[PDB]
């Protein structure tokens, strides 16, 4: 199957061909970040490209809120 798939309580994103997304994924307007092993980052602040970003328990990137964050969420 395609899209979000939970395996052992862990979230992964499967593209149409079968392949696993990694990196930033946009789903329904929200941003998510995947680790290089495809697993979804959750509930924490992390650093990529020298900018700080925060994802909640659902894995969505917090944007335009509070430390501040913009449309990109930096």
By CB under 6 A, name the binding residues for ligand PC. 19, 24, 31, 61
Alpha-carbon torsion (1, 17, 19, 3), positive or negative: negative
Q: Classify burial at 37, counting beta carbons within 10 Å of its beta carbon; exposed 0-12, middle 13-18, buried 19 or more.
A: exposed
User: Which has the closest alpha carbon to 62: 38, 46, 34?
Assistant: 46
8 makes contact with a copy of itself (CB under 8 A):
no
Show contacts with a copy of itself in window 15-74 (CB under 8 A): 15-17, 19-31, 36-38, 47-51, 63-65, 70-72, 74
Footprint on this chain of a copy of itself (rule: CB under 8 A): 1-5, 13-17, 19-31, 36-38, 47-51, 63-65, 70-72, 74
């Amino acid at each position: 199957t395609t899209g979000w798939k939970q395996e052992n309580g862990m979230w992964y994103f499967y593209n149409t061909d079968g392949s696993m997304a990694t990196g930033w994924v946009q789903v329904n307007g929200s941003w998510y970040y995947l680790n290089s092993n495809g697993s979804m980052k959750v509930n924490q602040w992390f650093q990529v490209g020298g900018k700080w970003y925060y994802v909640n328990t659902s894995g969505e990137l917090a944007v335009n809120t509070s430390y501040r964050v913009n449309d990109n969420g930096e």
